Amino acid sequence: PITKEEKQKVIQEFARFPGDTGSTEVQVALLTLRINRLSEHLKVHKKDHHSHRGLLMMVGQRRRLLRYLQREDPERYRALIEKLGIRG
Amino acid sequence: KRQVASGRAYIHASYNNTIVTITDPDGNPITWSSGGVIGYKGSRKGTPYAAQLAALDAAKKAMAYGMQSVDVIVRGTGAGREQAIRALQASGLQVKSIVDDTPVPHNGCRPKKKFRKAS
Amino acid sequence: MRRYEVNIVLNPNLDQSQLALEKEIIQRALENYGARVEKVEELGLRRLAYPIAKDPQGYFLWYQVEMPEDRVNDLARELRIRDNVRRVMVVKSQEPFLANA
Amino acid sequence: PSRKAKVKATLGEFDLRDYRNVEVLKRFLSETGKILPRRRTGLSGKEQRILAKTIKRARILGLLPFTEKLVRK
RNA sequence: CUUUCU
RNA sequence: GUGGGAGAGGGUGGUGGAAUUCCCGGAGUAGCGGUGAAAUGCGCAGAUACCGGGAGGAACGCCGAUGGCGAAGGCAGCCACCUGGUCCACCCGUGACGCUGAGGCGCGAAAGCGUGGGGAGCAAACCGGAUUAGAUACCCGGGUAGUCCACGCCCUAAACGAUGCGCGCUAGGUCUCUGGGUCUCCUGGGGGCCGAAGCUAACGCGUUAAGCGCGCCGCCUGGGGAGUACGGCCGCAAGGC
Ligand SMILES: [Mg+2]
Ligand SMILES: [Mg+2]
Ligand SMILES: [Mg+2]
Ligand SMILES: [Mg+2]
Ligand SMILES: [Mg+2]
Ligand SMILES: [Mg+2]
Numbered sequence: 281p282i283t284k285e286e287k288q289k290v291i292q293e294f295a296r297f298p299g300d301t302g303s304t305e306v307q308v309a310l311l312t313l314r315i316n317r318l319s320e321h322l323k324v325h326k327k328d329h330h331s332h333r334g335l336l337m338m339v340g341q342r343r344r345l346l347r348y349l350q351r352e353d354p355e356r357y358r359a360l361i362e363k364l365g366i367r368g
Numbered sequence: 369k370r371q372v373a374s375g376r377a378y379i380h381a382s383y384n385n386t387i388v389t390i391t392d393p394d395g396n397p398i399t400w401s402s403g404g405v406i407g408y409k410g411s412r413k414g415t416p417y418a419a420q421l422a423a424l425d426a427a428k429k430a431m432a433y434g435m436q437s438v439d440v441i442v443r444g445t446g447a448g449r450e451q452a453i454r455a456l457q458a459s460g461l462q463v464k465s466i467v468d469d470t471p472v473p474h475n476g477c478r479p480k481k482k483f484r485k486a487s
Numbered sequence: 488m489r490r491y492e493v494n495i496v497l498n499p500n501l502d503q504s505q506l507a508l509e510k511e512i513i514q515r516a517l518e519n520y521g522a523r524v525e526k527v528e529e530l531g532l533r534r535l536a537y538p539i540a541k542d543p544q545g546y547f548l549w550y551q552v553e554m555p556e557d558r559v560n561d562l563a564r565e566l567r568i569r570d571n572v573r574r575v576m577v578v579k580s581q582e583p584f585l586a587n588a
Numbered sequence: 589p590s591r592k593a594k595v596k597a598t599l600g601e602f603d604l605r606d607y608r609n610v611e612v613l614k615r616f617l618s619e620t621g622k623i624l625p626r627r628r629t630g631l632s633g634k635e636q637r638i639l640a641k642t643i644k645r646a647r648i649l650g651l652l653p654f655t656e657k658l659v660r661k
Numbered sequence: 662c663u664u665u666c667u
Numbered sequence: 668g669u670g671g672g673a674g675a676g677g678g679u680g681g682u683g684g685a686a687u688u689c690c691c692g693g694a695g696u697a698g699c700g701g702u703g704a705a706a707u708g709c710g711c712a713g714a715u716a717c718c719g720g721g722a723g724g725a726a727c728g729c730c731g732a733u734g735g736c737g738a739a740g741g742c743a744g745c746c747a748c749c750u751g752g753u754c755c756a757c758c759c760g761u762g763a764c765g766c767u768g769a770g771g772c773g774c775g776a777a778a779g780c781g782u783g784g785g786g787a788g789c790a791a792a793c794c795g796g797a798u799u800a801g802a803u804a805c806c807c808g809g810g811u812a813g814u815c816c817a818c819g820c821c822c823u824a825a826a827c828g829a830u831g832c833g834c835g836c837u838a839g840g841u842c843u844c845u846g847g848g849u850c851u852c853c854u855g856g857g858g859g860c861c862g863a864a865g866c867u868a869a870c871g872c873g874u875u876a877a878g879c880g881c882g883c884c885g886c887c888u889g890g891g892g893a894g895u896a897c898g899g900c901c902g903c904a905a906g907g908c
């Protein structure tokens with residue numbers, strides 16, 4: 281489970297500025313947390329499909345955001361990735 | 369034969385035949401009877417009458433052993449059931465109690481087709 | 488980490504030595520799994536609603552504790568080993584839900 | 589026809605989640621260890637729901653029965 | 662029990 | 668985002684009691700069983716009925732709903748862990764980042780298939796007993812695959828609301844599940860019933876539209892021949908598209 285703190289350390293880590301919780305980087309940031317967390321859970325439980333449908337969604341919701349970013353501030357984009365590890 | 373006075377009267381009622389078994393205070397059978405035990409050979413072993421005869425048979429046979437008081441234990445949901453319960457009462461034996469203990473699965477084995485289709 | 492209610496029912500025929508014997512254990516078991524121990528209640532001998540292990544009674548235990556989620560199952564695994572330990576039931580601790588009040 | 593009291597009416601405040609309070613939990617069982625219907629436990633969809641799971645907990649601990657023998661008849 | 666056809 | 672909420676949503680581990688079967692001990696005797704009635708069958712190598720002990724497989728009474736969860740298929744004993752969705756309040760953050768979706772990929776009841784394991788109960792096939800004009804059936808006694816687990820495959824269905832997805836607009840009443848509030852009521856999400864306008868061949872539908880509109884996909888074009896043939900793709904096969 282992602283602890284509140286766990287999450288917080290992440291948001292602050294990305295917020296484009298103090299209080300920035302809903303920015304596209306924070307989001308792509310947060311989502312990426314859940315995804316990697318979900319993937320680990322799925323390596324074990326290869327048969328837990330309902331969860332995996334949940335995964336498929338997060339991933340889509342991500343690339344969609346990322347896409348928006350690359351379509352606006354390609355730098356932020358090119359940066360958001362390198363900082364994370366997406367497209368790896 | 370071995371004086372037991374009080375004991376248990378197990379009635380095993382059903383759609384195909386009733387059968388009673390008088391036991392000693394702790395489960396061991398003193399004597400038993402059934403619809404077959406008596407005359408009736410097939411279709412009517414179930415009839416409530418037969419149930420009466422059997423119960424009555426079971427009593428006598430058991431009173432001879434010194435019986436004269438029983439806690440009845442009803443099992444199965446067939447005809448003649450409630451009838452034998454009355455029988456044992458009209459018999460010598462004193463019916464000190466009555467208890468339906470028909471077993472029922474908290475859902476275990478797939479019943480025969482004859483009993484399925486229900487849910 | 489997280490609160491739990493470790494319920495334990497053990498053989499109702501122990502001499503004061505055999506009793507404290509299994510308790511000294513239940514304890515260690517707990518300590519072996521970083522399980523801290525908050526308030527406890529010991530009702531001991533009680534009349535079960537059904538024969539447990541052929542025996543018509545049981546000595547009850549109840550430990551409210553705070554332990555690591557990653558090891559609540561093992562805590563149980565371990566606990567169960569004892570022959571005098573008849574039942575172990577750990578439970579995540581929920582607030583009360585008073586009714587008719 | 590169910591026209592008497594409810595295991596709730598005839599009683600006061602209690603912790604529906606308390607699986608050890610055998611005293612009051614019993615009240616919610618039939619003449620047999622069967623869990624009473626909300627129809628007569630007076631509870632509510634939600635409360636009746638929690639009871640069901642609490643009673644089931646007590647049963648495993650052996651505080652409450654799974655089934656009882658019907659007397660009389 | 663089953664219990665066809667016109 | 669923050670704070671809250673309900674749930675048989677999913678995966679793994681463990682665990683409880685009822686019942687059936689078998690085994691062991693006790694007690695006990697002549698039948699039990701099954702049916703419209705019977706017979707096959709089981710029982711003196713002692714069955715049936717009864718008490719005690721054990722083993723094992725499968726399923727989880729009451730709660731239970733007229734209920735809840737999931738995209739669907741589906742999902743209910745209890746405990747822990749792991750994980751998906753979702754709703755409400757606060758208006759706090761980004762700033763149209765949206766909708767739909769050919770193809771692709773994934774999931775997908777039952778039966779079925781492969782390898783291994785398991786097998787209590789039930790039961791295609793089958794072995795018999797009845798019924799009958801016959802009875803390759805319905806009824807009765809047996810019974811194998813299978814049903815259960817793992818891993819791999821198959822991918823169908825009355826896979827049904829026989830109703831694609833999203834958004835906006837158009838009387839209310841009543842019952843209910845779940846949240847919020849100033850809580851004999853207001854408001855939000857879900858499930859039902861009745862109904863305004865309107866729609867419909869009719870039946871019916873009616874803020875959970877089958878009404879009034881926009882966007883995108885899919886599909887239909889008389890019946891039989893036929894979901895057949897051929898071809899192609901998929902599959903170990905059955906067979907699927
Ligand atoms: Mg704002
Ligand atoms: Mg701005
Ligand atoms: Mg597009
Ligand atoms: Mg399938
Ligand atoms: Mg299958
Ligand atoms: Mg197979």
Ligand SMILES: [Mg+2]
């Ligand atoms: Mg059979």
Ligand SMILES: [Mg+2]
């Ligand atoms: Mg035949």
Ligand SMILES: [Mg+2]
């Ligand atoms: Mg048959």
Ligand SMILES: [Mg+2]
């Ligand atoms: Mg309404």
Ligand SMILES: [Mg+2]
Binds near residue numbers: 850
């Ligand atoms: Mg309220």
Ligand SMILES: [Mg+2]
């Ligand atoms: Mg509504």
Ligand SMILES: [Mg+2]
């Ligand atoms: Mg409503």
Ligand SMILES: [Mg+2]
């Ligand atoms: Mg009209």
Ligand SMILES: [Mg+2]
Binds near residue numbers: 869
């Ligand atoms: Mg008309």
Ligand SMILES: [Mg+2]
Binds near residue numbers: 873
């Ligand atoms: Mg209507």
Ligand SMILES: [Mg+2]
């Ligand atoms: Mg044609």
Ligand SMILES: [Mg+2]
């Ligand atoms: Mg080929």
